[PDB]
């Protein structure tokens, strides 16, 4: 029959825009592959499952996929959703390739079925920790995190790397996802002389910290990672977003080879920023591996991914024995005004 492929993502909630990056990128790839003859002569059927960035909801989504005969899942977005959902998939013969979950644990559990098109946070924290050392040598650094597996994980990888290169944070604090008032923490950071705020977490909380920090007169730069790369940050944060820093892969939309693809998304009215092409590529990889493997059986395609190499919107993609991709590493971005005059992220 058709090859049933699920999108497991935050289609609603604070991270809906990310959920839409993943959905649109996955739907466009299925559309393109199908018009090309599908996977090994078979058409791809997309199903959608909304995890609302909640682990328990993600587990329910995963069990549903299992039931609907899903064979491949592109997703999820959050590490804390992906890690538990992957067990459910591992047990019920379903290959999961995440375009966005970066926590090392995802691929460090020996599971047959876990792959990514994105990097991992030992890599990302490496880069950031070093950068803090290469540019804020004597700054009073606060490390703040959202108490999630992703957010605390990245903040810990960043702290580890920084601590090691010589930089010793003056504060290390967790906040709760959904919290809206950071005055106390901000008042704490001001007493501490904080001039750099390193945030392991997502854009919602990040934008509020930026906004309120400026309003309380804390002159500190926020440095974060992949979780803040959505154009909503500028709205949440306001003009205070200027000068914010964050790590992320090289922007795939800037790849000359993607020019026509990017233009197609844009003609459809969607700006395929950030994780959109990472998701497109997840789909490319499944198709490329299945062809190399002469099979659409998930266990076999998984073996194919680990062995083969495949053309994608992200470049030539290969995978190591754990399912991690071999691709260009994390680079630093700064938030500045674009041509249109609004703040966005540009590689330094
Ligand atoms: C959600 C995403 C931005 C993050 N990399 C995570 O693993 O949760
Ligand atoms: Ca998480
Ligand atoms: Ca390999």
Distance separating alpha carbons of residues 142 and 14, to the nearest angstrom: 24
Resolution of the coordinates in A? 1.7
Give 125's contacts (C-beta < 8 A, 6+ positions apart).
Answer: 154, 155, 156, 157, 158, 159, 160, 161
121-249+330-348 in CATH: which number? 3.40.50.2300
Distance in Å, CA 324 to ligand 3 centroid: 9
Spatial CB neighbours of 279, under 8 Å, sequence gap ≥ 6: 7, 21, 22, 23, 24, 25, 26, 29, 74, 99, 100, 117
Distance 53 CA to ligand 2 centre (A): 8
Which tokens in the block code for residue 132? 């803090």
At a CB cut-off of 8 Å and minimum separation 6, what does 341 contact?
Answer: none
For residue 305, the CA-to-ligand 3 centroid distance in Å is 7
Using the mean position of ligand 2's atoms as its centre, give its distance from the Cα of residue 80 in Å: 4
* Spatial separation of the C-alpha atoms in residues 282 and 27, rounded to whole Å: 11
Distance, in Å, from the CA atom of 84 to the CA atom of 232, rounded to the nearest integer, reads 28
Q: Is 137 exposed, middle or buried (0-12, 13-18, 19+ CB in 10 A)?
A: exposed
H or E segment at 239? Answer: none
Return the CATH fold of 1-120+250-329. Answer: Rossmann fold (3.40.50)
Cβ of residue 241 lying under 6 Å from some atom of ligand 1? no
Q: Which ligand 1 atom lies nearest to the CA of residue 80?
A: 8
Nearest bound ligand to the CA of residue 304: 3
Long-range own/partner contacts, residues 294-301 (CB < 8 A, 24 or more apart) = 294/40, 295/40, 296/3, 296/39, 296/40, 296/42, 296/71, 298/71, 298/72, 298/93, 298/94, 298/95, 298/113, 299/93, 299/95, 299/112, 299/113, 301/72, 301/95
Q: What tokens appear for 114 in the block?
A: 């876990």
Q: Name the residue of 51, 76, 103, 230 to mutate for ligand 1: max ligand atoms within 8 A of Cβ.
A: 103
All CATH 3.40.50.2300 domain ranges in the chain, comma separated: 1-120+250-329, 121-249+330-348
Residues 85/62, Cβ–Cβ less than 8 Å: yes
> Helix, strand, coil: what percent of the chain each, to 5?
45, 20, 35
Nearest atom within ligand 1 for CA of residue 78: 8
Q: Per the structure block, which two tokens stand in for 86? A: 């992957």
Structure tokens given for 21: 């990056």
């Amino acid at each position: 029959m058709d090859v049933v492929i699920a999108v497991g993502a935050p289609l609603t909630g604070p991270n809906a825009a990310f959920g839409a990056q993943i959905q649109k990128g996955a739907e466009q790839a299925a559309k393109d592959i199908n018009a090309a003859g599908g996977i090994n002569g078979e058409q791809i059927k997309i199903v959608l499952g909304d995890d609302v960035s909640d682990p328990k909801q993600g587990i329910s989504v995963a069990n549903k996929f299992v039931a609907d005969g899903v064979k491949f899942v592109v997703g999820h977005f959050n590490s804390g959703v992906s890690i538990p959902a992957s067990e459910v998939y591992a047990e019920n013969g379903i290959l999961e390739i995440t375009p966005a979950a970066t926590n090392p644990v995802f691929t460090e559990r020996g599971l047959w079925n876990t792959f990514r098109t994105c990097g991992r946070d030992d890599q990302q924290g490496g880069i950031a920790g070093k950068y803090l050392a290469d540019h804020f040598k004597d700054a009073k650094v606060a490390i703040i995190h959202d108490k999630t597996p992703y957010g605390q994980g990245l903040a810990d990888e960043t702290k580890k790397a920084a601590n090691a290169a010589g930089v010793t944070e003056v504060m290390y604090e967790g906040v709760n996802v959904g919290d809206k008032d950071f005055s106390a923490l901000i008042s704490k950071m001001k007493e501490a002389g904080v001039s750099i705020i390193y945030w392991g977490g997502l854009h919602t909380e990040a934008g509020l910290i930026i906004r309120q920090a400026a309003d309380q007169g804390l002159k500190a730069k926020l440095v974060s990672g992949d979780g803040i790369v959505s154009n909503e940050l500028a709205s949440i944060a306001g003009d205070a977003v200027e000068g914010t820093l964050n790590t992320f892969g090289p922007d795939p939309t800037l790849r000359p080879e993607n020019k026509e693809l990017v233009e197609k998304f844009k003609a459809a009215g969607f700006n395929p920023e950030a994780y959109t092409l990472y998701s497109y590529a997840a789909m490319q990889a499944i198709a490329g591996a299945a062809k190399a493997a002469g099979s659409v059986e998930p266990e076999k395609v998984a073996e194919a991914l680990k062995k083969g190499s495949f053309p994608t919107a992200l470049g030539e993609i290969s995978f190591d024995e754990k399912g991690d991709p071999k691709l260009p590493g994390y680079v630093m971005y700064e938030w500045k005004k674009g041509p249109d005059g609004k703040f966005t992220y540009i590689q330094q």
